[PDB]
Design a protein around this ligand. Sequence first.
Ligand SMILES: *[C@@H]1O[C@H](CO[C@@H]2O[C@@H](C)[C@@H](O)[C@@H](O)[C@@H]2O)[C@@H](O[C@@H]2O[C@H](CO)[C@@H](O)[C@H](O)[C@H]2NC(C)=O)[C@H](O)[C@H]1NC(C)=O
Ligand SMILES: *[C@@H]1O[C@H](CO)[C@@H](O[C@@H]2O[C@H](CO)[C@@H](O)[C@H](O)[C@H]2NC(C)=O)[C@H](O)[C@H]1NC(C)=O
Ligand SMILES: *[C@@H]1O[C@H](CO)[C@@H](O[C@@H]2O[C@H](CO)[C@@H](O)[C@H](O)[C@H]2NC(C)=O)[C@H](O)[C@H]1NC(C)=O
Ligand SMILES: *[C@@H]1O[C@H](CO)[C@@H](O[C@@H]2O[C@H](CO)[C@@H](O)[C@H](O)[C@H]2NC(C)=O)[C@H](O)[C@H]1NC(C)=O
Ligand SMILES: *[C@@H]1O[C@H](CO[C@@H]2O[C@@H](C)[C@@H](O)[C@@H](O)[C@@H]2O)[C@@H](O)[C@H](O)[C@H]1NC(C)=O
Ligand SMILES: O=c1cc(CO)occ1O
Ligand SMILES: [Zn+2]
Ligand SMILES: [Zn+2]
Length: 446
Amino acid sequence: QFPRQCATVEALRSGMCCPDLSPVSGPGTDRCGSSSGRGRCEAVTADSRPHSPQYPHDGRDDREVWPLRFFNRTCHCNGNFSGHNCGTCRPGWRGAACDQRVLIVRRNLLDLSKEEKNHFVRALDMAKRTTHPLFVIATRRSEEILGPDGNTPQFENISIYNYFVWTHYYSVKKTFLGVGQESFGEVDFSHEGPAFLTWHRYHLLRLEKDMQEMLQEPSFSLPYWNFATGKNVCDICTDDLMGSRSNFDSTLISPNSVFSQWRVVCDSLEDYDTLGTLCNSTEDGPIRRNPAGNVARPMVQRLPEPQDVAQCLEVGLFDTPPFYSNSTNSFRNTVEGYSDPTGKYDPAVRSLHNLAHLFLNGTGGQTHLSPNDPIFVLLHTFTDAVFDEWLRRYNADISTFPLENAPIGHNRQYNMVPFWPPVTNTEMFVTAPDNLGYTYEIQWPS
Ligand SMILES: *[C@@H]1O[C@H](CO[C@@H]2O[C@@H](C)[C@@H](O)[C@@H](O)[C@@H]2O)[C@@H](O[C@@H]2O[C@H](CO)[C@@H](O)[C@H](O)[C@H]2NC(C)=O)[C@H](O)[C@H]1NC(C)=O
Ligand SMILES: *[C@@H]1O[C@H](CO)[C@@H](O[C@@H]2O[C@H](CO)[C@@H](O)[C@H](O)[C@H]2NC(C)=O)[C@H](O)[C@H]1NC(C)=O
Ligand SMILES: *[C@@H]1O[C@H](CO)[C@@H](O[C@@H]2O[C@H](CO)[C@@H](O)[C@H](O)[C@H]2NC(C)=O)[C@H](O)[C@H]1NC(C)=O
Ligand SMILES: *[C@@H]1O[C@H](CO)[C@@H](O[C@@H]2O[C@H](CO)[C@@H](O)[C@H](O)[C@H]2NC(C)=O)[C@H](O)[C@H]1NC(C)=O
Ligand SMILES: *[C@@H]1O[C@H](CO[C@@H]2O[C@@H](C)[C@@H](O)[C@@H](O)[C@@H]2O)[C@@H](O)[C@H](O)[C@H]1NC(C)=O
Ligand SMILES: O=c1cc(CO)occ1O
Ligand SMILES: [Zn+2]
Ligand SMILES: [Zn+2]
């Protein structure tokens, strides 16, 4: 979403989001850090190609051709510089000249020290309460973005971790069609399509970076939860990490965990889809969680089996046509969890990443809310580990990642919605140790 200095009337009407870095000579004199050689304000590249025929409402939705409905000029940064005003570095690089390499290690949460476990939990909690220093979220679609009087931008501050929740919601929300009409839901800019793995990889990377700056700890890293244990229970749902079941309500989190204090955003879908508004920063009820609780649906009462991870890493093509939740022999669709681990599509099957979401039988299993439960972070870093191992094992073969005819939002060169600055799926389709500055300490079965 947008740098708080781009969420003004001036910026939105010019279509330019090219903020200053250190504007010595006055405003506008250091856009994109051009005085320092770090970047320059220039035209946005956005994907032109056709998408699948499943979305019929070209022209109606602000997530189309992202971000051209809001800005047509951004900062491009030179070299290994990066960020909304080119004032930081590309993933894997540090220093004022962005010329020092770093490599941080993402580890299994159960293998951390008592002190490292406590530091992680207290850091999530701080992110939940700490206002994001750069990004503000929009509460109205673009037509009403400047407010009733036309001069009041409809943006709100939000916490670091609620930003993480918001962007996932924005990429899954329905297309508003107008009051009186049913909003359109056959669209998902981050699920059911080739962009699944790369969307969520940038999602994690932006959170890791935000927390590093919040803690001032360059080497802070996000752990993972190995959920492919076949267990009846959530082995990380304990009060020293992530929270156990409350004894007073079997669908709430233990009061001995900070996460029982969290309150969720984006849970008023009735309003958003009828009034045409967006999720805002006001929090509501608590997290609901009930591991193995879905008696009505016995298939989602046990976690994926260790063999399932072995099997899906044998699927060799990243994706297959029609590039959707009914793709067969698609590694994206297998690890996302709409195929079985072998790649066999069946409308009833729920494996791997999907299964892990449904196992929680609660807030974590509802697509518009699931990042509110912080197990989301650990569930997706493990999914990203599987992604990374595939990228290594098949030499990052991006050839099956379609350039066109994918569901809207999922073409290879689509800017992932709504990340800022614009970033394409191609930019995340690399092995993480050599290119993004992080690696997984992990061993795979066979
Ligand atoms: C680049 O953008 C400018 C600014 O227009 C805004 O850009 C988008 C956010 C979109 O939502 C527009 O509605 C915004 O107005 C464009 O300049 C304006 O273009 C509109 C046409 O939509 C025109 O009616 C206005 O009079 C123009 N105003 C100014 C100050 O230029 C410009 O055309 C865009 N260039 C492109 C897309 O190549
Ligand atoms: C996967 O699902 C899609 C969407 O349901 C199927 O594609 C076509 O979907 C259109 C609407 O976009 C329907 O009108 C058609 O009935 C579908 N095409 C047919 C039946 O040829 C697609 O067929 C599915 N792929 C499978 C099942 O392999
Ligand atoms: C932020 O979102 C909340 C939740 O949707 C909004 O509160 C709702 O406001 C509408 C007014 O149209 C009421 O009908 C709902 O009953 C309210 N919901 C709750 C849970 O109180 C809130 O108004 C939004 N903020 C802004 C500035 O739009
Ligand atoms: C969690 O699982 C329970 C089942 O254990 C779900 O509750 C059932 O929901 C279905 C369909 O919504 C109903 O037909 C059943 O009658 C419900 N059973 C009970 C005992 O409530 C619940 O919806 C699930 N919630 C989430 C978020 O996954
Ligand atoms: C959003 O909040 C603004 C405050 O901005 C700054 O945000 C963080 C870094 C905190 O350290 C805070 O103390 C800072 O002042 C306010 O000016 C205002 O309420 C909000 N502005 C908009 C445009 O929503
Ligand atoms: O991605 C998700 C998948 C499921 C189950 O399919 O629930 C929530 C999600 O965010
Ligand atoms: Zn998701
Ligand atoms: Zn997910």
